[PDB]
Design a protein around this ligand. Structure first.
Ligand code: ADP
Ligand code: ADP
Ligand code: ADP
Lengths: 726, 249
């Protein structure tokens, strides 16, 4: 970025008396790509926006903006605060504009307010406004404020001379100016920025750059595939990259292509492309491509493969034909025909995936920005407790929570619009009941995320942590050292020993401090792929690994598949595929393959071959610093008080595994919950928060023994450590 | 629960032309005597009858018609509402067609036999399609409104004649016009029926509440279940308690 976010400006008094005119300086408008007659989008406090025309000023300061008292009150700011300016170069003219004056400004005057106030104020003026601007109109020896109600270009527009002005009777008053309907934009798009920036580049370079693609010679984004779960803001993304760029959108959908009969399938599909040809600033988006073009064995018909044929003969031959780009949507990239997915056209494919916790948080922030809540819910625990939900399901979650809030209160008056909005309130219980009544769709899917451990759960093995940093982090940070000597780094590592979940948190910490993606490969999913006789599922997983580069590929226990066999054997139907993936693994892109086993005697010797899975790391029994780190993780995200004896467990529970010391904490927590609720039972029988688990309950939690490790297996692990002791 | 909705008096007679007067309720609201007074039952049903005819009912109760008691609600001993709506325009000789009991006895002139010697200047201002039972001897003969000369609720002029070419069709068509719509009439797994009742009833009667939320969750509802469960009657029961066009395919 730049210093101090240089669109931030200081409000100052103006010289011009115009309401819709703000003033800047000469090198500021040159740096911010601003003209002397162009329009901007001003943003300020209390999430209030403004649309204005920047004019040149000579008395204006370098880092200040001159404006009158109207925009200062419209942005709800006083003298001395900071405001921001955003350029708005894509404004369209308005069609119908509804204006209603405030009640105190029309007391004493009667008649038509259009020909006296509205007609001279907009007589070839072209003043831009937004929804909620209160602008002062002078006339009849008075000063009457007029407020924008609703425009057909609903976010922002310029008053055309053909715009019909609506000034009907019974106006609204000064209120909380609630938002209820709008048009989408880049801020409306949620958490997709790692791919939103890429597709932003691949549509911004087609914008107003004809000679740039002549400098390339060829246009690189000929066809763009956007695949993911159904409903991941797909047409929202397509509509968002159209209006702010400035083009003709003209969406068509595959069901509407099949909606016409035989012979009419060429009608309104080719004609869409001559429509795109006659309007060179345009994009093309098609929805449900699997309904048009499935796989070749799935093409069980004649008219549908005819439609596939006109799509192919229209998609191959638009090479520099009004420089239009083409977008498409599908569930998975292999669901479409692979002959469509070749090169020359339809090559710039991109994944979207599910949102993360912060992406879900900002999606819910967008969906709850327009609706006033009870302002005591944090909205972060709501977006953090959800898991595997599409953004459409978050919108449905917000709608059902509002339905819960409406159904909680009884019936009001029937139909003013000032009773069921200012009484809107949602609780933690409202969204919690809404969380139960919310069917997800992104479940049963390989999630992609950057998790958060922040390196301090890990106890001991600091040289092992340094080796894991040098294998993964430092090729990303300093690849010039590895290109200095040309050494191919060890991209594959093995974990063996007790059944620990600390290797999972190790991989999570690698993805965290690497700031890279994570993929959790499940052992039950591996046996699903084995017993389901579908060994081709590895390929799209590794394709998602390539498209989510850099990433961490945490595989579970691979010896369980060999445990299912034991007549004997070395490799299985899933095992031999990942060796071909490792041979197909490039040394670039910083995609790491990390393995997690328990018993390495029953694994493939081809895994033990060099270049496939390179080095083996033993994870030993937990140590006392790792035991107090385990107790710190037990104290992580849990309300606890003082007088805790963290050194009490490590002196005698050294023979137990780390899950036993974890289960001590959950058992003491359930004991605390049980004693608190029987204290509630005592309170009800008789008709303080007690936030600390008292350590007698901790000692009753550590009393029972469930030692899951075996000492002979520990000697077996030490025997393989001595085998690797060279 | 509304002040208009009040408990109903028992049916003294089976006449559509007689409504008893409740004088404390007449002192409560502002109802004007004369031609037309609007009344509502339940499930979005509209009807009009005259007032100040009998003066038999006591305070906070009004005696109404028999046909607005058996229809326009789910049962007797329930609420009835009133509404002032006077001096509407006039119609001409509606409800010429009987449906059920013409096949026994004689046909007659079909309105000079049982309609003319029974009415007392309340010229049946009912919904076009609603019924009313009247006969001289048996007093259980219904008819159906088929002539639609007036578009709003209008009384007709007395001693008017139109074409008498109407023929009876069926008896069960009155029962099949509802086809037994009722939440008591439906069987009901009451939990799932409660959520579907909520998620259609919040669409019901409050179209502007969708502007308050801004998001509409009902855009389509699947009905999972094994066949034989009344799935084609569950949607029929959800309809016509709301009041809309059902139109199954
Ligand atoms: N990522 C998202 N962010 C915000 N809103 C979303 C998102 N995904 C879906 N929605 C909501 O879901 C509705 C339909 O979007 P979507 O299901 O993506 O359409 P399509 O499936 O045709 O791409 C929209 O009204 C939008 O508000
Ligand atoms: N380097 C390390 N050495 C020892 N223990 C560790 C290390 N890093 C993390 N741990 C701890 O080991 C525990 C994982 O072992 P455990 O809970 O017994 O296995 P599981 O949960 O798979 O049954 C985690 O709670 C973690 O805090
Ligand atoms: N749950 C129910 N409540 C009331 N009537 C029912 C119910 N289930 C079946 N019936 C009766 O059974 C007959 C056939 O209905 P049914 O087989 O349930 O249709 P569908 O299976 O399409 O819902 C209907 O005439 C209906 O009266």
């Amino acid at each position: 970025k730049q210093k101090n976010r240089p669109n931030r400006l200081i409000v100052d008094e103006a010289i011009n008396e115009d309401n819709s005119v703000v003033s800047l300086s000469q090198p500021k408008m040159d740096e911010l790509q601003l003209f002397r007659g162009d329009t901007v989008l001003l943003k300020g406090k209390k999430r209030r926006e403004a649309v204005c025309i920047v004019l040149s000023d000579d008395t204006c300061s370098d880092e200040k903006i001159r404006m009158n008292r109207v925009v200062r009150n419209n942005l709800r700011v006083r003298l001395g605060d900071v405001i921001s300016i955003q350029p708005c170069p894509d404004v369209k003219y308005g069609k119908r504009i509804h204006v209603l004056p405030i009640d105190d400004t029309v007391e004493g005057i009667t008649g038509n307010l259009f020909e006296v106030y509205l007609k001279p104020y907009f007589l070839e003026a072209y003043r831009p406004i937004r929804k909620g601007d209160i602008f002062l109109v002078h006339g009849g020896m008075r000063a009457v404020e007029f407020k924008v109600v609703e425009t057909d270009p609903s976010p922002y527009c310029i008053v055309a001379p053909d715009t019909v002005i609506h000034c009907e009777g019974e106006p609204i008053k000064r209120e909380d100016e609630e938002e209820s309907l709008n048009e989408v934009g880049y801020d409306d798009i949620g958490g997709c920025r790692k791919q939103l920036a890429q597709i932003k580049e691949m549509v911004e370079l087609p914008l107003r750059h004809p000679a740039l693609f002549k400098a390339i010679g060829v246009k690189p984004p000929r066809g763009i595939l956007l695949y993911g779960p159904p409903g991941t803001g797909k047409t929202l993304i397509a509509r968002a990259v159209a209006n702010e760029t400035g083009a003709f959108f003209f969406l068509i959908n595959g069901p509407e292509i099949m909606s016409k009969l035989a012979g009419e399938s060429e009608s309104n599909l080719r004609k869409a492309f001559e429509e795109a040809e006659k309007n060179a600033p345009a994009i093309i988006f098609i929805d449900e491509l699997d309904a048009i073009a499935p796989k070749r064995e799935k093409t069980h018909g004649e008219v549908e493969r005819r439609i596939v044929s006109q799509l192919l003969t229209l998609m191959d031959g638009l090479k520099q034909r009004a420089h239009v780009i083409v977008m498409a949507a599908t569930n998975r990239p292999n669901s479409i025909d692979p002959a469509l997915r070749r090169f020359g056209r339809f090559d710039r494919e991109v994944d979207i995936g599910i949102p993360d916790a912060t992406g879900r948080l900002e999606i819910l922030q967008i969906h709850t920005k327009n609706m006033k809540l009870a302002d005591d819910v944090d909205l972060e625990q709501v977006a953090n407790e959800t898991h595997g939900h599409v953004g459409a399901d978050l919108a449905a979650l917000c709608s059902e929570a509002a339905l819960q809030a409406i159904r909680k209160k009884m019936d009001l008056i029937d139909l003013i619009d000032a009773e069921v909005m200012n009484s809107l309130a949602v609780t933690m219980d409202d969204f919690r009941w809404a969380l139960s009544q919310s069917n997800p769709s992104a479940l049963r899917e390989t999630v992609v995320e950057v998790p958060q451990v922040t390196w301090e759960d890990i106890g001991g093995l600091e040289d092992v942590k340094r080796e894991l940093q040098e294998l993964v982090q430092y090729p990303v940070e300093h690849p010039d050292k590895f290109l200095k000597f040309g050494m191919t780094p060890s991209k594959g590592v093995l974990f063996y020993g007790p059944p620990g979940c600390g290797k999972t948190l190790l991989a999570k910490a690698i993805a965290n401090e690497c700031q890279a993606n994570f993929i959790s490969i499940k052992g039950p999913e591996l046996l699903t792929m084995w017993f389901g006789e579908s060994e081709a599922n590895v390929r799209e997983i590794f394709d998602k690994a390539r498209q989510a580069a850099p990433c961490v590929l945490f595989f579970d226990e691979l010896d369980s598949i060999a445990k299912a066999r034991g007549g004997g054997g070395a490799a299985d139907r899933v095992i031999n595929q990942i060796l071909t993936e490792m041979d197909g693994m490039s040394t670039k892109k910083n995609v790491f393959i990390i393995g997690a086993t328990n018993r390495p005697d029953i694994i493939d010797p081809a895994i033990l071959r060099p270049g496939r899975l390179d080095q083996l790391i033993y994870i030993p029994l937990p140590d006392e610093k790792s035991r107090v780190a385990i107790l710190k993780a037990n104290l992580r995200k849990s309300p606890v008080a003082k007088d805790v004896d963290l050194e009490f467990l490590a002196k005698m529970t050294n023979g137990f595994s780390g899950a036993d010391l974890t289960e001590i904490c959950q058992r003491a927590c359930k004991l605390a919950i049980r004693e608190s609720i029987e204290s509630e039972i005592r309170r009800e029988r008789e008709r303080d928060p007690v936030p600390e688990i008292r350590r007698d309950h901790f000692e009753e939690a550590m009393r029972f023994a469930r030692r899951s490790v075996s000492d002979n297996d520990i000697r077996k692990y030490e025997m393989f450590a001595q085998t690797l002791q060279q």
